[PDB]
Design a protein around this nucleic acid. Structure first.
Ligand SMILES: O=c1cc[nH]c(=O)[nH]1
Length: 223
DNA sequence: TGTATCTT
DNA sequence: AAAGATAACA
């Protein structure tokens, strides 16, 4: 119980009774019986437990969870102490250090600090079979995360979406590019970071857009 | 050994 | 689809 934060469950509950969702949860359940799936069930929706849905100001959309033991916990790119930051996160910190002058490696990989500030740390696909990246794509997660993006698009204003990677970028078409700001770059994984993530300056750019629309910027060092 | 994106 | 090529790093 209580895997979903109250305000999130209230606005996404309409998906629960849909065939694709019932079949999606059915698939993940069958998978957990034969393989190790990440993150654990009680953490698949951690991204709804950090702030009220109406308080989201920035959305970071990744591809799918870390596929190693004890890494993924429901917030994209984040890992709970004492787990060391995986390759993707070390790259995010590397960019943050050159993008934000006051930013220095926090010495851990827990990104709850950002989420509590209204930064939704979402992935297009919310589960993954151990050691197999994007193994759970096209099973129904995409329509669910589409519902999340769609609600935010219609009920919020001036949000800043950071779509990292081709899969996250599939959601760009559902975002009113006039009402919200969409920043797109390569995924921070070592296998693609060199295609543009380094130098993208999305963190400083995100705050410029927020402050321009009179909103409090994100303190990226607040972790 | 191990962490995307484009092409056939 | 899904496998192969291409691709930084350590
Ligand atoms: O949560 C995560 C971690 C790495 N890469 C992603 O796309 N998401």
């Amino acid at each position: 119980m209580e895997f979903f934060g109250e305000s999130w469950k209230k606005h996404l509950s309409g998906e629960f009774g849909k065939p694709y969702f019932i079949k999606l949860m059915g698939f993940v359940a069958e998978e957990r019986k034969h393989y190790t799936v990440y993150p654990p069930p009680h953490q698949v929706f951690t991204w709804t437990q950090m702030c009220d849905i109406k308080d989201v100001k920035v959305v970071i959309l990744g591809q799918d969870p870390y596929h190693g033991p004890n890494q993924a916990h429901g917030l994209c790119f984040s890992v709970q102490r004492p787990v060391p930051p995986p390759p993707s996160l070390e790259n995010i910190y590397k960019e943050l250090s050159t993008d934000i002058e006051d930013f220095v490696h926090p010495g851990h990989g827990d990104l709850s600090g950002w989420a509590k500030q209204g930064v939704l740390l979402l992935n297009a696909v919310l589960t993954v079979r151990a050691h197999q990246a994007n193994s759970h794509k096209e099973r129904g997660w995409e329509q669910f995360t589409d519902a999340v993006v769609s609600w935010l698009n219609q009920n919020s204003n001036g949000l800043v979406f950071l779509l990292w990677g081709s899969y996250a970028q599939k959601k760009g078409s559902a975002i009113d590019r006039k009402r919200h700001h969409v920043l797109q770059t390569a995924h921070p994984s070592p296998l693609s970071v060199y295609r543009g993530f380094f130098g993208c300056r999305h963190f400083s750019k995100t705050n410029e857009l927020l402050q321009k629309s009179g909103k409090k910027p994100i303190d990226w060092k607040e972790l």
